[PDB]
Design a protein around this ligand. Structure first.
Ligand SMILES: [Ca+2]
Ligand SMILES: [Ca+2]
Ligand SMILES: [Ca+2]
Lengths: 152, 152
DNA sequence: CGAAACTGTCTCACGACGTTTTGC
DNA sequence: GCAAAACGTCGTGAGACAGTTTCG
């Protein structure tokens, strides 16, 4: 439950609004009660020759990791608890991705809840829809509508 | 000669390191003495549906303008004086583009002497080589080397 | 089972120039 | 003659997912 310096949050919020992404996904997966996993991800993408900057975010944020994918790299943070702590503090300084950060926080708080009702889980999936709508979504497939394959 | 708020600068620096570009160019033009114009530009690019963010920047920075170019728009700041003032205050919070910022600042401060000595003009055209090397330059064509057509 | 990771890629939304036209 | 504006383009450097797997 680390407390972040405001100057750091202000700059990073700007950077996140730029090269960052706040993602919410519904991943079909049979091992789950509702045959889908609710996935949340905070990420920052950057050309690999500049990964030092992402590695630094790992150290500064105190959690997450950097993944290499060729000419580009990403700082990824998915652990729900640290993500909630982080987005809570980052959120007030965001200008382009604040709505989605808030939706993510809202989803996180409703996870245990939605993981018990086919309709509560479906409501949460509705939140995921909104986040995707707010992002420049171009290759999305699984939506709350598709999860509504739960009826039967 | 406007003084910007620190939290505004902190956020913007991060956003600039993300979607911005600090540019220096040598534009071949016959109307100039040394057949080239020293052009400097600070710009922030964004998908046109988010043009409001760029329009808002024009108000917050107090100078500059937004141009449209298809699916994308750009906030542009070229006026050398407000540019110098703006970058002077932003530069300390930059992390990926701090070097190019200080170089632009330096080019501006040396512009006057650059007009006289055809040799100082080439040394300034050096500063611009440096800036392009720092950016992810890939379509550049006019360098200090080409300027050396100042040999007759 | 389920939190989180490992792995790959579609379609841009940017970055970083260049070329031309003004205007004092 | 130089500053600032206009208008147009190369080649990504991002964003935003998808899909399958690890293992307490
Ligand atoms: Ca962006
Ligand atoms: Ca960037
Ligand atoms: Ca970007």
């Amino acid at each position: 439950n680390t407390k972040y310096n405001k100057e750091f949050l202000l700059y990073l919020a700007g950077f996140v609004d730029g090269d960052g992404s706040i993602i919410a996904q519904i991943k079909p997966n049979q091992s789950y009660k509702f045959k889908h996993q609710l996935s949340l991800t905070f990420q920052v993408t950057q050309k690999t020759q500049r990964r030092w900057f992402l590695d630094k975010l790992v150290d500064e944020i105190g959690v997450g990791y950097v993944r290499d994918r060729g000419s580009v790299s990403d700082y990824i943070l998915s652990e729900i608890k640290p993500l909630h702590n982080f987005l809570t503090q980052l959120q007030p300084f965001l200008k382009l991705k604040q709505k989605q950060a808030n939706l993510v926080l809202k989803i996180i708080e409703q996870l245990p809840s939605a993981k018990e009702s086919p309709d509560k889980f479906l409501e949460v999936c509705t939140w995921v829809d909104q986040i995707a709508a707010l992002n420049d979504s171009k290759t999305r497939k699984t939506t709350s509508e598709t999860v509504r394959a739960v009826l039967d």
